Design a protein around this ligand. Sequence first.
Ligand code: MG
Ligand code: MG
Ligand code: MG
Ligand code: MG
Ligand code: MG
Ligand code: MG
Ligand code: MG
Ligand code: MG
Ligand code: MG
Ligand code: MG
Ligand code: MG
Ligand code: MG
Ligand code: MG
Ligand code: MG
Ligand code: MG
Ligand code: MG
Ligand code: MG
Ligand code: MG
Ligand code: MG
Ligand code: MG
Ligand code: MG
Ligand code: MG
Ligand code: MG
Ligand code: MG
Ligand code: MG
Ligand code: MG
Ligand code: MG
Ligand code: MG
Ligand code: MG
Ligand code: MG
Ligand code: MG
Ligand code: MG
Ligand code: MG
Ligand code: MG
Ligand code: MG
Ligand code: MG
Ligand code: MG
Ligand code: MG
Ligand code: MG
Ligand code: MG
Ligand code: MG
Ligand code: MG
Ligand code: MG
Ligand code: MG
Ligand code: MG
Ligand code: MG
Ligand code: MG
Ligand code: MG
Ligand code: MG
Ligand code: MG
Ligand code: MG
Ligand code: MG
Ligand code: MG
Ligand code: MG
Ligand code: MG
Ligand code: MG
Ligand code: MG
Ligand code: MG
Ligand code: MG
Ligand code: MG
Ligand code: MG
Ligand code: MG
Ligand code: MG
Ligand code: MG
Ligand code: MG
Ligand code: MG
Ligand code: MG
Ligand code: MG
Ligand code: MG
Ligand code: MG
Ligand code: MG
Ligand code: MG
Ligand code: MG
Ligand code: MG
Ligand code: MG
Ligand code: MG
Ligand code: MG
Ligand code: MG
Ligand code: MG
Ligand code: MG
Ligand code: MG
Ligand code: MG
Ligand code: MG
Ligand code: MG
Ligand code: MG
Ligand code: MG
Ligand code: MG
Ligand code: MG
Ligand code: MG
Ligand code: MG
Ligand code: MG
Ligand code: MG
Ligand code: MG
Ligand code: MG
Ligand code: MG
Ligand code: MG
Ligand code: MG
Ligand code: MG
Lengths: 386, 52, 131
Amino acid sequence: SHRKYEAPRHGSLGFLPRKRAAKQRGRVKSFPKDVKSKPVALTAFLGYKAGMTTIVRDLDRPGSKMHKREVVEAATVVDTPPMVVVGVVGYVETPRGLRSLTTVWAEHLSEEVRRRFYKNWYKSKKKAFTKYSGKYATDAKQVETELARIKKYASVVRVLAHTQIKKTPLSQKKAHLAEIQINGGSVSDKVDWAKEHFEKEVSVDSVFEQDEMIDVIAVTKGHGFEGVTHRWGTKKLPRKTHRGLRKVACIGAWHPANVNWTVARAGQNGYHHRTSINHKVYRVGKGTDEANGATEFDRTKKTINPMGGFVRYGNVNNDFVLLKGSIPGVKKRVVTLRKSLYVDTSRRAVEKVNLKWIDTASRFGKGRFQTPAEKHAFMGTLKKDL
Amino acid sequence: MKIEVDSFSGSKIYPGRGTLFVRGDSKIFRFQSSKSASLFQQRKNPRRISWT
Amino acid sequence: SGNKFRMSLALPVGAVMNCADNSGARNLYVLAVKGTGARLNRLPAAAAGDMVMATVKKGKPELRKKVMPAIVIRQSKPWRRRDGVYLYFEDNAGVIVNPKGEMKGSAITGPVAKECADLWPRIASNSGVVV
RNA sequence: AAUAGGGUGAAGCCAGAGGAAACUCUGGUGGAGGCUCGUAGCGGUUCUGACGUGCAAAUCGAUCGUCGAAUUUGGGUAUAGG
RNA sequence: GGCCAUGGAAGUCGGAAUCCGCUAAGGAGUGUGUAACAACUCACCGGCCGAAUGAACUAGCCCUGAAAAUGGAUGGCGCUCA
RNA sequence: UAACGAGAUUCCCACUGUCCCUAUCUACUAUCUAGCGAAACCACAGCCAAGGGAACGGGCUUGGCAGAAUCAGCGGGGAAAG
RNA sequence: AUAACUGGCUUGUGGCAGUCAAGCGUUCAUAGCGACAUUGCUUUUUGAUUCUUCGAUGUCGGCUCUUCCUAUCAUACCGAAGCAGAAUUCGGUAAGCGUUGGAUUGUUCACCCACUAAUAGGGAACGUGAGCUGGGUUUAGACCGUCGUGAGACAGGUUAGUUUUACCCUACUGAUGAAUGUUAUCGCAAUAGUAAUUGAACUUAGUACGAGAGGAACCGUUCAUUCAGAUAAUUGGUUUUUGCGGCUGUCUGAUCAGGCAACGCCGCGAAGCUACCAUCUGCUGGAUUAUGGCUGAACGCCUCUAAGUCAGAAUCCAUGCUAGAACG
Ligand SMILES: [Mg+2]
Ligand SMILES: [Mg+2]
Ligand SMILES: [Mg+2]
Ligand SMILES: [Mg+2]
Ligand SMILES: [Mg+2]
Ligand SMILES: [Mg+2]
Ligand SMILES: [Mg+2]
Ligand SMILES: [Mg+2]
Ligand SMILES: [Mg+2]
Ligand SMILES: [Mg+2]
Ligand SMILES: [Mg+2]
Ligand SMILES: [Mg+2]
Ligand SMILES: [Mg+2]
Ligand SMILES: [Mg+2]
Ligand SMILES: [Mg+2]
Ligand SMILES: [Mg+2]
Ligand SMILES: [Mg+2]
Ligand SMILES: [Mg+2]
Ligand SMILES: [Mg+2]
Ligand SMILES: [Mg+2]
Ligand SMILES: [Mg+2]
Ligand SMILES: [Mg+2]
Ligand SMILES: [Mg+2]
Ligand SMILES: [Mg+2]
Ligand SMILES: [Mg+2]
Ligand SMILES: [Mg+2]
Ligand SMILES: [Mg+2]
Ligand SMILES: [Mg+2]
Ligand SMILES: [Mg+2]
Ligand SMILES: [Mg+2]
Ligand SMILES: [Mg+2]
Ligand SMILES: [Mg+2]
Ligand SMILES: [Mg+2]
Ligand SMILES: [Mg+2]
Ligand SMILES: [Mg+2]
Ligand SMILES: [Mg+2]
Ligand SMILES: [Mg+2]
Ligand SMILES: [Mg+2]
Ligand SMILES: [Mg+2]
Ligand SMILES: [Mg+2]
Ligand SMILES: [Mg+2]
Ligand SMILES: [Mg+2]
Ligand SMILES: [Mg+2]
Ligand SMILES: [Mg+2]
Ligand SMILES: [Mg+2]
Ligand SMILES: [Mg+2]
Ligand SMILES: [Mg+2]
Ligand SMILES: [Mg+2]
Ligand SMILES: [Mg+2]
Ligand SMILES: [Mg+2]
Ligand SMILES: [Mg+2]
Ligand SMILES: [Mg+2]
Ligand SMILES: [Mg+2]
Ligand SMILES: [Mg+2]
Ligand SMILES: [Mg+2]
Ligand SMILES: [Mg+2]
Ligand SMILES: [Mg+2]
Ligand SMILES: [Mg+2]
Ligand SMILES: [Mg+2]
Ligand SMILES: [Mg+2]
Ligand SMILES: [Mg+2]
Ligand SMILES: [Mg+2]
Ligand SMILES: [Mg+2]
Ligand SMILES: [Mg+2]
Ligand SMILES: [Mg+2]
Ligand SMILES: [Mg+2]
Ligand SMILES: [Mg+2]
Ligand SMILES: [Mg+2]
Ligand SMILES: [Mg+2]
Ligand SMILES: [Mg+2]
Ligand SMILES: [Mg+2]
Ligand SMILES: [Mg+2]
Ligand SMILES: [Mg+2]
Ligand SMILES: [Mg+2]
Ligand SMILES: [Mg+2]
Ligand SMILES: [Mg+2]
Ligand SMILES: [Mg+2]
Ligand SMILES: [Mg+2]
Ligand SMILES: [Mg+2]
Ligand SMILES: [Mg+2]
Ligand SMILES: [Mg+2]
Ligand SMILES: [Mg+2]
Ligand SMILES: [Mg+2]
Ligand SMILES: [Mg+2]
Ligand SMILES: [Mg+2]
Ligand SMILES: [Mg+2]
Ligand SMILES: [Mg+2]
Ligand SMILES: [Mg+2]
Ligand SMILES: [Mg+2]
Ligand SMILES: [Mg+2]
Ligand SMILES: [Mg+2]
Ligand SMILES: [Mg+2]
Ligand SMILES: [Mg+2]
Ligand SMILES: [Mg+2]
Ligand SMILES: [Mg+2]
Ligand SMILES: [Mg+2]
Ligand SMILES: [Mg+2]
Ligand SMILES: [Mg+2]
């Protein structure tokens, strides 16, 4: 017999299997399509999710009842110090897909990225990349030969870049190393750009502008093993059900005499790889700016950091990106910011954002002050101040 | 924008922070947190609450 | 004639609100909400500014025992506005109207949500304090 | 042989008031009842709870009936397979 | 502008009629167009090219007729002057 | 038919996570370890689809396929056990 | 060796669909219908039978959940009308996507109220009881009515009546893992999966259309329904932070400070978790179906078709998204 009443399915079959991600660093599955006419530029950047805050902004959306009126919006802070370019990989078009031809590395690698290649760095002789560094012996013609091979045969050029994790408050010393595809210009232009940027820092302001729409690649929050009620949003069984109620009552018909792959089952929830698109860039802050949290209407000399610091992260002392809404991942997670794969002409994508005010009250409680000066002005002298 | 002030403790109410209450007599009350709201719901006296 | 943003629903089917107009009704018993789609086991629920099908449980006898449209003008369940403000009223109240949104009464006792007044001009005319 | 603590307040009795009489009314006192709330006790309503290769060949938890009598109960004793 | 119906109907709204005369040719008219005519178009006869053409029926293969629930069976692969 | 009722039934007030629609917390399990250590059941066993067949196959036929050793859950099947 | 489920043959019965066209449809068989007949399909009805099971396959219904069919209720694109507009009806490609909340009833069925784009019909052992529930049916107690001399019967009514076991195999959901010299980083992508849905308002516009009454649509703009994936700013919820405060009883001679009340109780309560009770996000190219066309024979004309060819759907394949073959 049929179901007595129809209802949509619980959960999406396009995010199966609901297993743990193979790596904690989210990987860019697809890069923006290459246009030769554009200038040579990076398509991605690596940052760390610091925390969430609140802003106030005047909306520019004609026909809305909030047009030219203040709206309060959730925002995410991504700590993004400049990345260091250390390598370049060439890919060749084959009838079996892209195939990496050659990887050329820089002469000098910093210690934080050389720790990436070790599980027990403190017990090691740290021999990584010493002979390759010797490949630069007084003529470095091997490197030029490999670069010429890339220029001659590669169709896709990607740079190898790592984060400067010593500039973040994290106690982890391993850098995060990733491939970022180079778009724009000819293959020769891309290879020359990659070589000239070896051991150099590249900032976010050279990759992303304010008001841009970008995508976020990250591994979500882990919740461990979860029952069907919260893993899949299935209906709880009645209170008086024997042997428990946080179940799916019928896990299959008699025939097919198997459990189908489409049936909700208990298992591991979260820690999934996600690609989230259309996040607007409200701010590309600079670490050297002493007025990160200041706007054109709030001239309070104020950093982006809340009072008492971001909870379980610390302070953002680097360049940062302030994105609208929420992005996948947890605090301290490495986040990949990728450029959009299409051209969006909707009013939401082309709106120019001008911020009124950024919340910097404490996130560790019901904070009611934006600044210690404001706090001491409100409360006056305390006993500990003498 | 405009910073509002708690109708109980006098705390500064920044945009979005806290709750807003409209009584029957249309008089508006602004609470910066649940604690100030909760004391008002328990009909306490802010004049007698030592930190307001 | 309007497009109001989503609000946290306050009044599921079976809720009894106060009747805030001088039509002579004192209760408005919610039995349906206009614009409610299909979802198994989900109760229709109304926010301020929603049209509702209701009966008068307590009031003048000629208003009682009938289905009539009504509009919710205030709700005690807190809801968030696009300006970030979470607000709530002391009670849930509604007023009897036409299918066109024209009130059965001519005056309203108590405050009215700005969502309802922005969406129903006939209730704004007959309304006093608008929050 | 055994049966916490309360509630209600029957006859009988004391004092006063009204009435021509026949009588009536009020305040106390008294402590009846297979009365009542409710322990121990005796029982076993519901969760159709736990358990259901159990602690247990009938138990466990909460909730519950009744709880001064047709009450509960030890021992002795009688009745024995159409 | 046939008769009668019709505000009007003249072939082309609708009813008895369906004729005659010239014709090789032409219906009291096959349509479009008008409030109605007009208008053009057709019915049939002409000129032109010049060798074939039209209708009904029969039965071979193919197609339509030909809708059900796990994915799937000319045994499978696959096969088209097989 | 007053009163009584762990009797059956309908409505109202109050109250409630029964529900909209779920979320959070505690202890004990489950989990891992040392020690200890049963039982049910057992033709042989254990991936699917169709076919035919004692007319609902794990085995047969025709196909899909198929790579050691494994852990926690689960209740579709073993037309599971009793 | 034989009935009461499922399953199998049949398809009378049930349901659905054709053809022939006397009539209906102001004229007018076929816009839409269609008698007398007649050809079929289906197995969601009921019969017919008794092949399997009586050393037992747990027999109603609901809840929960997945999948499948199309004979399509809604949503996409189109053809037809006795289509002026609006509305409506018939049909084609179509199962991608949805198909509800309740009063009474154990009900399946039904009927009412109401929202909605719609509240289509079905299958999967009449799906689904080691998933639940146990209201019904169908043991034993008991009452009533009718029947019986009676014991007792009723396919009549009523009330009370134990719903057991998974640690095995497989399958599912997740999780490790030997060896393909060792170890480390970054990758490629076979194959498998896949995702969005529907409504409303403003403008167009009181415009086209229409005597009037009435009354559209494309571009664009703002919201909402159902669904999906995250996230914890804010707000709310939660409290063994037993963090802070308060309260009762008792114990430590008092105080201070504490113990116990099977977390003693109460107010607040960060962090963490979490809610359409909160916020964010949900992509763009090609090829096609129906269909409308171009050129153009067959067939000196005609003809979307025969060769060739254009556009084109919620379809399909890609882009994008998930896993990454543990013998790529
Ligand atoms: Mg579906
Ligand atoms: Mg709006
Ligand atoms: Mg290391
Ligand atoms: Mg060299
Ligand atoms: Mg960095
Ligand atoms: Mg969720
Ligand atoms: Mg039970
Ligand atoms: Mg916080
Ligand atoms: Mg603060
Ligand atoms: Mg329901
Ligand atoms: Mg239900
Ligand atoms: Mg006593
Ligand atoms: Mg009594
Ligand atoms: Mg005692
Ligand atoms: Mg006892
Ligand atoms: Mg039990
Ligand atoms: Mg219990
Ligand atoms: Mg057990
Ligand atoms: Mg309890
Ligand atoms: Mg008693
Ligand atoms: Mg007694
Ligand atoms: Mg006695
Ligand atoms: Mg005795
Ligand atoms: Mg004794
Ligand atoms: Mg005997
Ligand atoms: Mg004998
Ligand atoms: Mg004998
Ligand atoms: Mg005998
Ligand atoms: Mg044909
Ligand atoms: Mg055929
Ligand atoms: Mg041959
Ligand atoms: Mg009773
Ligand atoms: Mg009784
Ligand atoms: Mg009754
Ligand atoms: Mg009765
Ligand atoms: Mg176990
Ligand atoms: Mg052990
Ligand atoms: Mg066994
Ligand atoms: Mg297979
Ligand atoms: Mg069988
Ligand atoms: Mg089989
Ligand atoms: Mg088989
Ligand atoms: Mg077998
Ligand atoms: Mg054989
Ligand atoms: Mg074989
Ligand atoms: Mg089973
Ligand atoms: Mg077994
Ligand atoms: Mg059995
Ligand atoms: Mg038949
Ligand atoms: Mg028939
Ligand atoms: Mg049959
Ligand atoms: Mg049989
Ligand atoms: Mg049997
Ligand atoms: Mg057997
Ligand atoms: Mg049987
Ligand atoms: Mg079975
Ligand atoms: Mg049964
Ligand atoms: Mg069809
Ligand atoms: Mg589907
Ligand atoms: Mg509905
Ligand atoms: Mg009911
Ligand atoms: Mg019901
Ligand atoms: Mg019936
Ligand atoms: Mg069966
Ligand atoms: Mg059947
Ligand atoms: Mg069944
Ligand atoms: Mg069946
Ligand atoms: Mg079962
Ligand atoms: Mg059972
Ligand atoms: Mg059942
Ligand atoms: Mg039963
Ligand atoms: Mg029963
Ligand atoms: Mg019945
Ligand atoms: Mg009986
Ligand atoms: Mg008799
Ligand atoms: Mg009977
Ligand atoms: Mg009878
Ligand atoms: Mg009983
Ligand atoms: Mg057992
Ligand atoms: Mg190895
Ligand atoms: Mg694929
Ligand atoms: Mg949907
Ligand atoms: Mg006019
Ligand atoms: Mg426009
Ligand atoms: Mg809607
Ligand atoms: Mg969701
Ligand atoms: Mg959602
Ligand atoms: Mg809180
Ligand atoms: Mg909290
Ligand atoms: Mg002391
Ligand atoms: Mg003590
Ligand atoms: Mg969207
Ligand atoms: Mg062709
Ligand atoms: Mg392989
Ligand atoms: Mg393989
Ligand atoms: Mg494979
Ligand atoms: Mg494989
Ligand atoms: Mg591999």
